[model samples]
Structure formats: structure tokens, C-alpha cells
Target: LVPRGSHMPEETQTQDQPMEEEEVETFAFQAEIAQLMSLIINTFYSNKEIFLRELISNSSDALDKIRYESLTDPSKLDSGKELHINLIPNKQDRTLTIVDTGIGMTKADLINNLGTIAASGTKAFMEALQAGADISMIGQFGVGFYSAYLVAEKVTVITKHNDDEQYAWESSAGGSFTVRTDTGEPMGRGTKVILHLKEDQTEYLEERRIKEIVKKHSQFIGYPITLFVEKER
Candidate 1:
């Protein structure tokens, strides 16, 4: 269906292999994205602290997926043997980031998993959560990732899958998001989600606050959760 072309090729190569260029692709979210996120931030949860739990729980699931996949193919753990979650809060930047030593998302995964909200079970999550569903059930539908918007205005995810190139996915919690080839330092496997906390949500940048939530919600999780404090810049 594509019609525009600069030059005509004799062979007409239709190869669609992945390119490592610095090309970036921006995609606008569906109309419901704004409404769904506003619902999550304004009325869905009585406690905003549940966001940390949602994120850590997401890391746990990724770790589990990589671990289970490694059972048959052990090379997936070549990047690191230990599977854990690291929470890094930078006060100067007003960002709270979660890094996991788990399975990461490829370019397609980033697009489909985060971009295609409707196909990612977002509608199902809204229906189920509105009916008083548990976090576990919502997570199964991949909606917990949106919980970051509850405390932040923007969210960025950098992920690297074992068999796929690394990519950076970013959104302002509305309108559109961009995914591009990550050419920086190579993080072997896993994902890092960074939240730009709102001005009033500065409490989330505190180590004590994050620790308390981790202890309350994911204390018994199989994976270890480590917090790195940030000094004032």
C-alpha cells in the first residue's frame, strides 16, 4: 500500500531486516490512553504507594520469564547470573528508575507491549480493574506498567532482549511515545524504567519511602530488591 518512492529499483529489494540506524519512530497513543491514565492517577487507587509495588512486581515477572526461559536455554544468563531488581532515585533529576536483571523487550515488544495499548489488553484491564480486580490480575494484562503515571508525568523504558537489539521507549503519559535504537552503553539483558516524578510527588525520590513500600508489598518476592540512594547534585 506504500506509494511514495524516490527511485525505482530494477531488482526491487523488499528486504525488511532491522537497521541499526539512529532512526526514531514516534507513535501517538489511542484516544483512550489519556482517559485511562487520568483514571489511574485521579481515582483508581486510594494509595499512590501502590505504584512502587506495581513496578517491583513487574520486575519480578520479567525475572521469572527469563529464568523459566533459561531452563531450556542457559545462555540467556550470560550477561549476569544473578537476577534482581535495583531501584535508583536521583533527586537532582527528580527521577525514580527501576532496573531489573530479567528478560527485556525487543523493538516489536516495545511497540506492541507499550504502543498498542488496545492490543495489549488495556481495555480488558480497565474493565477488570473497574470491577475491583486485584493487582495480580491487572498485571497479567500488562496494565501495571502504566502505574508509573500515577506518580510521574513522564515514563521512559530502556530494554534489551537477549536476541534483539536494545531500544528506548518514552512517553509523556499522554499523546504519543517514541522508540529508537539505543546506541549508548550496552545493558546485556533486562529493562530500566525511569519515572520523572511530579513536583508534588517528590516523596517518591526518598530512599526511606521507596524502601518502606518495597518492604510492605514485595518483601517476600523471590528476587532481591536493592535501593541506591542519590546524593544532591
Candidate 2:
């Protein structure tokens, strides 16, 4: 598990393993990340429900990619893992973990997809938001992942892409994020996004709240979504 708000070591040296040459790269977001993040936080104040929608959409896309590829190359998803999503809400820890069995991200993919806003005319995009554009435009801009920070004080992602080894990426919405080789047991193939909920966002830790959100936004998602929470005794 990734320690909350702690700086990650620059090298891949786990406590149980000796130091060795490995690839782990840290990256700073684009200069406009602060502006973009601010827009996300402020603009979505009335619409935090979209966070889960964006995440589930991303998971569905990953599963679709793997499924499509498997038509020509079955080995792409031959790991025998079920294509599904699992939600684990820990009230004690104030964390909600969303795990998916779908195509994951490589280091470069992480950098390209998460580190920078890939869309052109980003300045105009920001400007349009300031001019009162619809919040729905955010997903089109490909920055939906950052919405996790709206309710989460910290976000941790453990993923394994078919072409890359398992690795972990973490951020605290501090404009800089860390990436390192994950020392935990492999996830087979897919991603796990752990959201450390803010004090005010603890309602998301409730199973009923999550189920309501899923039913409203993701009931038709291509994969199964299972919620694991404590039942009333």
C-alpha cells in the first residue's frame, strides 16, 4: 500500500528487496495543470457524481480495447481474469478503492495520458470554462481522471498493462505525481484506483451512496460492478 502524502523513493528498492536497476519515472504536470485542476474543483462542485461516471467509462474502454484486440490475438486477455469492477469501501480508513479487470496503463501511457492535457487549444478550453461552458465538456477534454481529486485528498493507482510490468502511480493533487514499480502481488491485468476521501466527502464511503451513483450513471456499463461493503448485522 502507498503511504499517504509521503514522497516516493527515486529508485525501485523495496524494503524486502535489494537495490537493482529498474525504471521508475517521476513527472510534473504541465504548467496549466493548476488552472485545469482549479477549474475541475470549482466547476464540478454541484456534480461530483460525474467522477464515478468518468472512472467507469474509462474501465469500460479498457475492457473494450482488450476484447477487441482478443478477436485477432486472444492472448491479449488470456490471463483468465474476469472482466469486472469491484468496489471496496473502508470507512475506518476513509478510502474507496475501485478495481477493474481491464487493460491497464504503461509508464509512458501514464505520463502521456495523465501528466499532460493532450487536447490542443487547452488555453482556449480553459478560457471557455471561465466563460461559463458546460461541465460536461470536461470528459471530452480527456481530463476526467483528475476529477478524483475533487473528493479525494490522495489518489493511488496500481496497474499492470499487458506490455508493461505492474507499477503504482500516486498523487495528492499537488501538481506533481510519483510512479514506481509496485512491490505488491500482481493484479493479473487491470487497474486499481484508491481514493482517500476528504472529511466532507465521507458519504462516498457508504455502500448505499455508491450503489445509487452506479445505478444512475453506470448501470449500463459493459462489465459487472460488484460492491463489497459491510452488511448490517
- Please give each candidate's TM-score: 0.79, 0.83
Candidate 1 local lDDT, residue 49:
77
- Model 1: how far is 230 from its true place, Å? 3.1
Estimate, for each residue in 1-233, the C-alpha lDDT of model 2 and write its tens digit. 96676555855466676755545777787877756776675554667767888888888888888888888888865566788989899987999898998889987777777765445646777887888876556677757777787788888999998789888888876677888888668887899999998888898988789999998878778788899987766
Indicate which candidate wins on TM-score: 2
lDDT at 215, model 1: 78
Instruction: For each candidate in turn, give its C-alpha RMSD to the true structure in angstroms.
Output: 11.2, 9.1
